Scaffold this active site. Structure first.
Site, PDB file in Angstrom:
ATOM      1  N   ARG A  37      -7.239 -26.643  30.191  1.00 23.06           N
ATOM      2  CA  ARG A  37      -7.786 -25.292  30.251  1.00 23.06           C
ATOM      3  C   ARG A  37      -6.722 -24.401  29.581  1.00 23.06           C
ATOM      4  O   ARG A  37      -5.671 -24.880  29.114  1.00 23.06           O
ATOM      5  CB  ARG A  37      -8.040 -24.819  31.690  1.00 23.06           C
ATOM      6  N   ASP A  46      -4.965 -24.384  39.338  1.00 24.26           N
ATOM      7  CA  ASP A  46      -4.289 -23.776  38.216  1.00 24.26           C
ATOM      8  C   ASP A  46      -2.845 -24.218  38.067  1.00 24.26           C
ATOM      9  O   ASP A  46      -2.340 -24.336  36.945  1.00 24.26           O
ATOM     10  CB  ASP A  46      -4.304 -22.244  38.325  1.00 24.26           C
ATOM     11  N   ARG A  47      -2.127 -24.477  39.154  1.00 22.79           N
ATOM     12  CA  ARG A  47      -0.707 -24.748  39.010  1.00 22.79           C
ATOM     13  C   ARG A  47      -0.376 -25.975  39.843  1.00 22.79           C
ATOM     14  O   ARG A  47      -0.891 -26.120  40.956  1.00 22.79           O
ATOM     15  CB  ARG A  47       0.123 -23.577  39.513  1.00 22.79           C
ATOM     16  N   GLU A  72      -2.086 -11.443  31.533  1.00 22.97           N
ATOM     17  CA  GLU A  72      -2.755 -12.163  30.447  1.00 22.97           C
ATOM     18  C   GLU A  72      -3.053 -11.323  29.186  1.00 22.97           C
ATOM     19  O   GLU A  72      -4.131 -11.378  28.575  1.00 22.97           O
ATOM     20  CB  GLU A  72      -4.045 -12.750  30.968  1.00 22.97           C
ATOM     21  N   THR A 130      -9.319  -2.555  38.371  1.00 20.21           N
ATOM     22  CA  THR A 130     -10.280  -2.004  37.433  1.00 20.21           C
ATOM     23  C   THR A 130     -10.924  -3.084  36.557  1.00 20.21           C
ATOM     24  O   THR A 130     -10.398  -4.210  36.437  1.00 20.21           O
ATOM     25  CB  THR A 130      -9.551  -0.961  36.550  1.00 20.21           C
ATOM     26  N   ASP A 176     -13.733  -6.251  30.821  1.00 15.92           N
ATOM     27  CA  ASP A 176     -13.403  -7.279  31.798  1.00 15.92           C
ATOM     28  C   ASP A 176     -14.654  -7.932  32.383  1.00 15.92           C
ATOM     29  O   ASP A 176     -15.791  -7.470  32.194  1.00 15.92           O
ATOM     30  CB  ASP A 176     -12.557  -6.636  32.926  1.00 15.92           C
ATOM     31  N   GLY A 207     -13.551  -3.755  40.195  1.00 18.81           N
ATOM     32  CA  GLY A 207     -12.280  -3.994  39.578  1.00 18.81           C
ATOM     33  C   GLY A 207     -11.634  -5.313  39.991  1.00 18.81           C
ATOM     34  O   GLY A 207     -10.870  -5.891  39.193  1.00 18.81           O
ATOM     35  N   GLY A 245     -10.889  -9.184  40.505  1.00 16.57           N
ATOM     36  CA  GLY A 245     -11.223 -10.275  39.615  1.00 16.57           C
ATOM     37  C   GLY A 245     -10.940  -9.840  38.168  1.00 16.57           C
ATOM     38  O   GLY A 245     -10.529  -8.678  37.840  1.00 16.57           O
ATOM     39  N   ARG A 261     -18.859 -16.003  34.067  1.00 13.50           N
ATOM     40  CA  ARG A 261     -18.222 -16.403  32.808  1.00 13.50           C
ATOM     41  C   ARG A 261     -19.247 -17.138  31.966  1.00 13.50           C
ATOM     42  O   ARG A 261     -19.214 -18.354  31.789  1.00 13.50           O
ATOM     43  CB  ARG A 261     -17.012 -17.272  33.165  1.00 13.50           C
ATOM     44  N   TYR A 320     -12.061 -17.794  28.935  1.00 14.94           N
ATOM     45  CA  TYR A 320     -11.021 -16.986  28.306  1.00 14.94           C
ATOM     46  C   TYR A 320     -11.285 -16.854  26.801  1.00 14.94           C
ATOM     47  O   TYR A 320     -11.904 -17.730  26.207  1.00 14.94           O
ATOM     48  CB  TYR A 320      -9.625 -17.622  28.485  1.00 14.94           C
TER      49      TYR A 320
HETATM   50  C1  LIG Z   1      -0.632 -18.579  36.401  1.00 14.35           C
HETATM   51  C2  LIG Z   1      -2.032 -18.753  36.948  1.00 14.35           C
HETATM   52  O1  LIG Z   1      -2.249 -19.231  38.076  1.00 14.35           O
HETATM   53  N1  LIG Z   1      -3.009 -18.389  36.133  1.00 14.35           N
HETATM   54  C3  LIG Z   1      -4.446 -18.455  36.429  1.00 14.35           C
HETATM   55  C4  LIG Z   1      -5.016 -16.997  36.482  1.00 14.35           C
HETATM   56  C5  LIG Z   1      -4.495 -16.125  37.670  1.00 14.35           C
HETATM   57  O2  LIG Z   1      -4.944 -16.737  38.875  1.00 14.35           O
HETATM   58  C6  LIG Z   1      -5.099 -14.706  37.599  1.00 14.35           C
HETATM   59  O3  LIG Z   1      -4.856 -14.203  36.309  1.00 14.35           O
HETATM   60  C7  LIG Z   1      -4.507 -13.753  38.693  1.00 14.35           C
HETATM   61  O4  LIG Z   1      -3.125 -13.571  38.494  1.00 14.35           O
HETATM   62  O5  LIG Z   1      -6.441 -16.986  36.652  1.00 14.35           O
HETATM   63  C8  LIG Z   1      -7.216 -17.991  36.030  1.00 14.35           C
HETATM   64  C9  LIG Z   1      -8.695 -17.760  36.002  1.00 14.35           C
HETATM   65  O6  LIG Z   1      -9.451 -18.599  35.505  1.00 14.35           O
HETATM   66  O7  LIG Z   1      -9.156 -16.666  36.366  1.00 14.35           O
HETATM   67  C10 LIG Z   1      -6.596 -19.189  35.424  1.00 14.35           C
HETATM   68  C11 LIG Z   1      -5.086 -19.250  35.276  1.00 14.35           C
HETATM   69  O8  LIG Z   1      -4.664 -20.587  35.307  1.00 14.35           O
HETATM   70 CA   LIG Z   2     -10.619  -6.566  36.867  1.00 13.78          CA
END
Ligand SMILES: CC(=O)N[C@H]1[C@H]([C@H](O)[C@H](O)CO)OC(C(=O)O)=C[C@@H]1O
Ligand SMILES: [Ca+2]
Ligand SMILES: CC(=O)N[C@H]1[C@H]([C@H](O)[C@H](O)CO)OC(C(=O)O)=C[C@@H]1O
Ligand SMILES: CC(=O)N[C@H]1[C@H]([C@H](O)[C@H](O)CO)OC(C(=O)O)=C[C@@H]1O
Ligand SMILES: CC(=O)N[C@H]1[C@H]([C@H](O)[C@H](O)CO)OC(C(=O)O)=C[C@@H]1O
Ligand SMILES: *[C@@H]1O[C@H](CO)[C@@H](O)[C@H](O)[C@H]1NC(C)=O
Ligand SMILES: *[C@@H]1O[C@H](CO)[C@@H](O)[C@H](O)[C@H]1NC(C)=O
Ligand SMILES: *[C@@H]1O[C@H](CO)[C@@H](O)[C@H](O)[C@H]1NC(C)=O
Ligand SMILES: *[C@@H]1O[C@H](CO)[C@@H](O)[C@H](O)[C@H]1NC(C)=O
Ligand SMILES: [Ca+2]
Ligand SMILES: [Ca+2]
Ligand SMILES: [Ca+2]
Ligand SMILES: [Ca+2]
Lengths: 390, 390, 390, 390
Positions: B40, B73-74, B200, B221, B248, B268, B270, B298, B333
């Site tokens: 991803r 994610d991590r 991001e 927001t 967004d 806002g 998410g 998405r 994304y």
């Molecule tokens: C470093 C990390 O965990 N990044 C994750 C990011 C994060 O959770 C969000 O931007 C709030 O900080 O969100 C998402 C997502 O698909 O929405 C994927 C990324 O892998």
């Molecule tokens: Ca937002």
């Protein structure tokens, strides 16, 4: 930086011989461990040091689960791919250049120009790539499946030259030529003469002044539209080949179309892209052509030659020069291309050998190559060796 | 040596068009013979000669036995990998650059800088690599998942700029920018303005003096935080985009957020990383943006453009410029990047199209690419063609 | 032609951090489609532009049918292989250099020297390759498994330097050093001092005048034999490390060996190759070492540092510098190596993480890498993520 | 440009040693994930920088569904392929050079010449390729399976020499030598002397003035035809080797052939291609040879040497110089080649170790390599490690 490429005199030789077979589905068995890509419309184009083997993939491998729809020509997944000629176009060996369901490519001595067409049928789009960068596009002008050569474009002194066409596959499709330099269209060339239907032109240099093409008329005739394009004036004229050895499939018996060179004759509907390559000698020009062994089916492939003359006025039968593919084997699209030796150019004809089992299974192709080498007669034919059931 | 890269004027063109789909899982069927990596957060970054397609892998392939946890994610296994753009990212085609669960990379004209974040959530670490050598690190300043762009960093005259952020996903995450030269942090830039949550960032060059970024606010927001970073003074200021076309996801209906440009509005919480790239002309600048078709999910992706003005004060709707991904298809994304042609830069937007079957199966992504190409209007959309059950 | 390589000052930094995990068996599942090679004794060695990841393969892949015997150390099929560091050593990515069941390799600034040992146990043979060519050999002198480092040799100004040893694994094994230039042995160096048993030396430059090695004593002690080799006089002396932090496995508790630096102490039988790399600063020298977390088992791996002093006279405990591998994970051989940045050298320690299920299944290993970068403390540990049942 | 290759004095050394085993079918198990090509007649040829390992493939992999017919020697599918020496020859690693069921290749210092024979048995054709270009052909002169060396051709100052033969496998097959420069035949050399049957010559440079070949007589004798070709005059003479150590298989007991050196002897029908390479010293020449351990079967392989003398008149036994392959293991074709070190040439012998399970299963081969390396005596043998049932 490198010099621009120009056509040179061809290397010495008077017959073609079997060179190389790329048969990727010899490794596609369900018990095997390879991923040959499903493809059709292969063609080869060479630069100074290397040749690339291009094709339009359906973005699916054998063995795999995406065979349904691989017998269709246009969709949102077809891509132009390539490998170095001599490698086996698998998932990992190939490079994906751009989304395309019609293609061309050529090298100008400095960089590769890649052309692919996609978009909806009523409003498709020519897209041009020079190296890594997308550089230009050209719009549909007849709004009926804008499409291009399925074989190499041709560059001289940095100016490349590509046939495009648009219009009905059963009616009028007037082609145009694009003159492209460093990925950008610098001139559009509107042909004169017999222009009612020209598509899938296989083009090559007859000299530094003239590009010639043997094309397909899918609508009106089994004689091939033959383009003469003057590179110095950027003008082109099209007339039907007059030889009694009709090069399209389907076709009537040879010599059966009575009347002047322009008579369309019978069994004109349908067609196939045909091989055509030039043998440029100091004093004379060989025009080498291929056609299927069957008059009606895409089976077999034979080589024919004619030195000099005017293809638009000459009624003479072409000289049969050997069976490349027997009637037992598939003979589908064929194309010319030239390999750059040190001091001279080597003319070759490549043959698309499709594995066709109909729409209920995968549809893809091998590529067989014959090139001018030595003297004598052509000695051996090509088989794909593929059993579609494995 | 090679000289350093600078932003150049963009290549001529006025619409984007479908360029390329990299869909690795078209080859991941249990009965097939390939090994696409589970990934991803793909992004593309280019140097003068080639582009690289980066992604964060879960260090697993399809078909395979490690699908559990590929929707997290991590973790200790995620790695930043790359392939040359155009290649399918399989186990053998890919290069594993470093352990990382957040990444970025960019080329300065002489070498690649690769950036990856790993470590515990409360104490993560930015790691920078220049070519093969690991050269520097930066520590967590707010102890709550230090993270970076998930898209290319940007270099001018040897100095590369990178957004980093740290802080709560549902609270304050104040970003900073690091200025990096040959892999070592030579300056930290602390933005001023509307600073309570920026993450991001998708950044690019508006000129030789300004880097601009369209970012994500995951807390407050649906407007995107828009950074203007002055490269000459190494100062940055952030304010929310004032356009009524909220970029967004999730978001309220366009134009429903009342009050001045800075007002947060509703829905806002998410967010999503968004595509943004510049088209630099002599007297005009185009800012191209992408956002999902669905206001809350998405799904889908469409393109918008606005020429000139000031994003911070312009309330005007952006101009809809085409559907890149239909509502039917995943639109996750998106990111901008530029390909270097001989004399000009080609802007593109790439789209991550995630295959989401939930937590019970593999979770990975295809990457679709649209670039500025000729004139007219955008003609076709992208589908992944993947059936996740195979 | 290229300049000969010399050791340079190390790049700035004061802690190691997790860099990269190469875990080839994350793709070796019976339902997967990859062919990771079965290997043990991995090590890395770098030239000016690239690093290679070497290992000794059992010439078998997972999944496959040749697991039986992959837990043995010497046989007629083991080969020295490599891939570019960052690729995944599969059947197709790897290059097979020579038949070998013990190895080393290094780059002198111009070409790679490859060393492999094979032959019967009572009369084995050192074989040297410079690039593609086999150039020299060295005979067994104690007729009891002639063997070498299992990590990089070290070149300065074209002269490389390799430890070899021969003799009983439970008794005397006096090592020798070979001085090799362009693949040919130009000098044999017989050490002085404590020479009863030295094997698997991990060597590196302390300066342009001295090569140092932390080695294994499989017979007599848990303290490591520490070689100081003067490159200007081609002479070497060996004495036991005096630190109470004993670096071998097995070992007694720290500080438990009473007596002078030379006392062998207890639990001397058995051993493991240990990591050791130099951080050369203008005024001072850091010696970084690794050892297992368990005193008796090959589990876990911890980092330790000592600046300056004399390892042969200093009884001081080494400073614990972080857990690289937890006690739950395998920690087998470890080795030092240095990556060449533009102006300085980056010290790293690599860790062999063996997947051991005993002799009834496949036996192979992942390689984890930690390198000096930035300041602070080491932040995260490494897991292989491999389930041996898949 | 690059300059042309010439034979140089051999590198120092006095014994051969085990260098490398390429055993592709160690990865061909039905449960594994690799695709080693099914091949026979491997040989190696080197240019200044790299060596290539060539073979004639049956255009099929293991595991696969095309095992039938892989024990035949000639058909329409066999192709000359190569990989860089050290790589496993799989479907993706390999390059397919040309259609051929007999081959040769060599590098002249500037480019690779590739040679392949295909066509009907009664009218086969030599095809020569120089780099990418097909450049010339040579026709069958005796209409009975025109064929060539199955090992490297040899170039000096730009002129490459190649043995070809034509005629009955159990009768007269008079060879000729072609002199080829940049891919075109510039001279035909008709040998004089004992000329009634010479095939599969393994040739190398005895000096800058003489090429010598140890060949196979498939009809009349177990002695090898030994060619001396004078490069300055382009003349060649053949006489049988007079050594009592008969090098063909099958053969009578050593020394049992009574009468003068030219006497044919018994058990002459049948044959095998044999290894032969030169060690050129300032005042002495070593001729190294390999022959099967079994007098009648393709099992085992041992090495022999003789310094100086004249092969045509010396009856003395050759000196046994080691067992490369035990009686237990397959020992089929063997061949010589030389690797180029910086200043000297390294002679090697390679051995085809065929996996023969009969006509009911796949038939392919491993390649073992022994090269002149240091001093002493040859220490170890080679096994393929392949279980053909997997
Ligand atoms: C470093 C990390 O965990 N990044 C994750 C990011 C994060 O959770 C969000 O931007 C709030 O900080 O969100 C998402 C997502 O698909 O929405 C994927 C990324 O892998
Ligand atoms: Ca937002
Ligand atoms: C662009 C496109 O659809 N090309 C298709 C072409 C076309 O249908 C015909 O040339 C009439 O125009 O025909 C064929 C065919 O095998 O005969 C295959 C091509 O994929
Ligand atoms: C050449 C050789 O056999 N090396 C082996 C080595 C040796 O047995 C020991 O160092 C005593 O000499 O031990 C080990 C081991 O995991 O402990 C693995 C090596 O393959
Ligand atoms: C061109 C050709 O068929 N060569 C074949 C060769 C030939 O039959 C013999 O040398 C008599 O001429 O023999 C063999 C063999 O294993 O013995 C294999 C070769 O493929
Ligand atoms: C074409 O022109 C180039 C120079 O422009 C020349 O070298 C080449 O030989 C010409 N080719 C032919 C076929 O005349
Ligand atoms: C940016 O600066 C370089 C010189 O430093 C110049 O060549 C380039 O054209 C400039 N680009 C833009 C967008 O102004
Ligand atoms: C070692 O010597 C070289 C020149 O021979 C020098 O450039 C280098 O900096 C020296 N390295 C150290 C660690 O002193
Ligand atoms: C062969 O000739 C070249 C010069 O033409 C010379 O350099 C080389 O050393 C000679 N080799 C032998 C074996 O005499
Ligand atoms: Ca592969
Ligand atoms: Ca027609
Ligand atoms: Ca010990
Ligand atoms: Ca015989």
């Amino acid at each position: 930086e490198p010099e621009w490429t120009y056509p040179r005199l061809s290397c010495q030789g008077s017959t073609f011989q079997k060179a190389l077979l790329i048969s990727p589905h010899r490794f596609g068995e369900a018990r095997g461990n390879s991923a040959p890509l499903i493809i059709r419309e292969p063609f080869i184009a060479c630069g100074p040091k290397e040749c690339k083997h291009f094709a339009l993939t359906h973005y699916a491998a054998q063995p795999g689960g995406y065979y349904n729809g691989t017998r269709e020509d246009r969709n949102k997944l077809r891509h132009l791919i390539s490998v170095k000629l001599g490698k086996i176009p698998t998932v990992e060996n190939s490079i994906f250049h751009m989304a395309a369901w019609s293609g061309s490519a050529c090298h100008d001595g400095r960089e590769w120009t890649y052309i692919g067409v996609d978009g909806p049928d009523s409003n498709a789009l020519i897209k041009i790539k020079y190296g890594e960068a997308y550089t230009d596009t050209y719009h549909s002008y007849a709004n009926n499946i804008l499409r291009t050569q399925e074989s190499a474009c041709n560059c001289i002194g940095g100016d490349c030259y590509l046939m495009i066409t648009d219009g009905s596959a059963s009616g009028i499709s007037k082609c145009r030529f694009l003159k492209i330099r460093e990925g950008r269209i610098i001139k559009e060339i509107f042909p004169t003469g017999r222009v009612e239907h020209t598509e899938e032109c296989t083009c090559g240099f007859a000299s530094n002044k003239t590009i010639e093409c043997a094309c397909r008329d899918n609508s009106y005739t089994a004689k091939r539209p033959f383009v003469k394009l003057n590179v110095e004036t950027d003008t082109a004229e099209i007339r039907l080949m007059c030889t009694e050895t009709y090069l399209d499939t389907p076709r009537p018996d040879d010599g059966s179309i009575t009347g002047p060179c322009e008579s369309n004759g019978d069994k004109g509907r349908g067609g196939i892209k045909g091989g055509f390559v030039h043998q440029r000698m100091a004093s004379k020009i060989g025009r080498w052509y291929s056609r299927t062994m069957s008059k009606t089916e895409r089976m077999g492939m034979e080589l024919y030659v004619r030195y000099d003359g005017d293809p638009w006025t000459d009624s003479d039968a072409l000289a049969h020069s050997g069976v490349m593919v027997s009637m037992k084997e598939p003979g589908w699209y064929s194309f010319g291309f030239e390999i750059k030796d040190k001091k001279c150019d080597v003319p070759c004809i490549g043959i698309e050998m499709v594995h066709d089992g109909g729409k209920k299974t995968w549809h893809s192709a091998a590529t067989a190559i014959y090139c001018l080498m030595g003297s004598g007669q052509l000695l051996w034919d090509t088989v794909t060796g593929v059993d579609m059931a494995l």
